[PDB]
């Protein structure tokens, strides 16, 4: 198991922790998504987590087939966005030269 | 202030995508049938000739049955690169 | 505060990409040869079996000869979707 595979494993295991609780066991409903986000994105989504309605629009946006649950396929878009927004913050206001990372999201 | 023509161009690309994403369903989702309407209306023949379903398979990277905005930007990038090469024929 | 394991996972994906992007050249560019090293070291067999060059053609959406970070996220998304389906076998 590589570093990337392990990270992938952690995304899948975290999704499964909340998807199994209610309704479809392989999808996240509004309440399960709120719980995942409150706990396991508590730093990356600190500011959004203070506004339950912001969390609701995020879920509405990720729910690409409009069936009011997040499949894993829909959810991994949020992981990619947060990864991308973390890397962006590492480079926010970068003046160069060369490559350096400031602290990422939730820091 | 007033936007430059380049900046208006970028915002208009947003506007284009939403003509199709706002047809039904999720507001940032272009379903397979909407994507055929988008390709046929907005893209040239050398883009369309690929087939709307081959494009849909290429663009739906998470295979959730929709092209979201970032996936549509893949299409925009490929059309721009293609349009640029054609300008050197 | 201390990051959750999920958040550390996302930052680690950044870290993984940079092991290969910082080998040479542009700091956010993974050239074709670096991408083979990335696939062979970081991905499972059912990902690698595609071939590093077929992956490179898929990921380099702007055909500039490099996989930047957003293009690498296409790879990450496809691996996650694949890993999830396999967990239901």
């Amino acid at each position: 198991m590589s570093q990337l595979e392990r990270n992938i494993e952690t995304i899948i295991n975290t999704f499964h922790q909340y998807s199994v609780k209610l309704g479809h066991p392989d999808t996240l409903n509004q309440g399960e998504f709120k719980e995942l986000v409150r706990k396991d994105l508590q730093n990356f989504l600190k500011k959004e987590n203070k506004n339950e309605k912001v969390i609701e629009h995020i879920m509405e946006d990720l729910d690409t087939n409009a069936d009011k649950q997040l499949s894993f396929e829909e959810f991994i878009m949020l992981m990619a966005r947060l990864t991308w927004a973390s890397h962006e913050k590492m480079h926010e206001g970068d003046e160069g030269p060369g490559h350096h990372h400031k602290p990422g999201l939730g820091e | 202030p007033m936007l430059t023509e380049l900046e208006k161009a970028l915002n208009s690309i947003i506007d284009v995508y939403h003509k199709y994403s706002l047809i039904k369903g999720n507001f940032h989702a272009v379903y397979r049938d909407d994507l055929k309407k988008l390709l046929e209306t907005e893209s040239p023949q050398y883009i369309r000739k690929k087939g709307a379903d081959v494009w849909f398979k290429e663009l739906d990277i998470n295979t959730d049955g929709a092209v979201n905005f970032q996936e549509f930007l893949i299409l925009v990038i490929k059309m721009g690169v293609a349009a640029h090469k054609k300008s050197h024929e | 505060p201390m990051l959750t394991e999920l958040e550390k996972a996302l930052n680690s994906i950044i870290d993984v990409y940079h092991k290969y992007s910082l080998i040479k050249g542009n700091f956010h560019a993974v050239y074709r040869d670096d991408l083979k090293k990335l696939l062979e070291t970081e991905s499972p067999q059912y990902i690698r079996k595609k071939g590093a060059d077929v992956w490179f053609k898929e990921l380099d959406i702007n055909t500039d000869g490099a996989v930047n970070f957003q293009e690498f996220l296409i790879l990450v998304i496809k691996m996650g979707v694949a890993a999830h389906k396999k967990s239901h076998e």
Binding site: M1, E9, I12, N13, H16, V20, H24, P25, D26, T27, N65, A66, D67, Q69, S71, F72, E73 | K24, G25, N26, A29, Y31, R32, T63, D64, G65, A66 | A83, H84, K85, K86, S87, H88, E89
Partner: peptide, 18 residues
């Protein structure tokens, strides 16, 4: 844990039915 055979059904209706 390495998720293998999670044993409940995978969601598969990745399309619009509204």
């Amino acid at each position: 844990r390495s998720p293998e055979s999670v044993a409940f059904p995978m969601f598969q209706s990745h399309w619009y039915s509204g």
